[PDB]
Design a protein around this ligand. Sequence first.
Ligand SMILES: Cc1nc2cccnc2nc1C
Length: 209
Amino acid sequence: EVETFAFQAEIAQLMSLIINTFYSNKEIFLRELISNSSDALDKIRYESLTDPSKLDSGKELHINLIPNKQDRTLTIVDTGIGMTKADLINNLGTIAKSGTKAFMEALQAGADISMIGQFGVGFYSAYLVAEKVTVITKHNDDEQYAWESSAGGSFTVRTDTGEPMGRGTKVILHLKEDQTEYLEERRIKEIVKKHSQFIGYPITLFVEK
Ligand SMILES: Cc1nc2cccnc2nc1C
């Protein structure tokens, strides 16, 4: 069972701008996704201070970066609080509607795309380097779901039957044909050291065959 939804008009415009605008500093996508992972790990850590049972779905708080050259996918896995079904379809889109507006007015006043995180819509920067994004997430209060969108104004949501996660968010970036540089170890190491050197969580960079 696959449910197809439509992006809000303002979010579809933001994805079209990210995809069509000429902007060479594409590497900032990883800092936005890592900062997203660090935020979700902060939420579940704070919530577990008044409820240790929230860590029953996994005590470890870390971030993993998994490149795969055969699938041409870059995966950012974190053991954060996760996202519910209400989050994927309505809550994030409601919040992103005002952050997208403020992000567009700033772009017309001199700002550039790299400052997208200051408006709380940095997740969509994944479409700088990805033709399709698949997000596997699991919250303590909801089932495991699979979010997918190749832009174009629509996205899908379904109950994930794959490998269980326990708790966290898994962002799979199906990279564009000319963006395979973000699968090489030295390139990912260079980006992490330059943009995410002080993340208060262990970041493990997986290696390939
Ligand atoms: C799938 C999704 N994951 C997000 C993670 C952080 C912030 N916003 C997000 N928005 C969406 C639609």
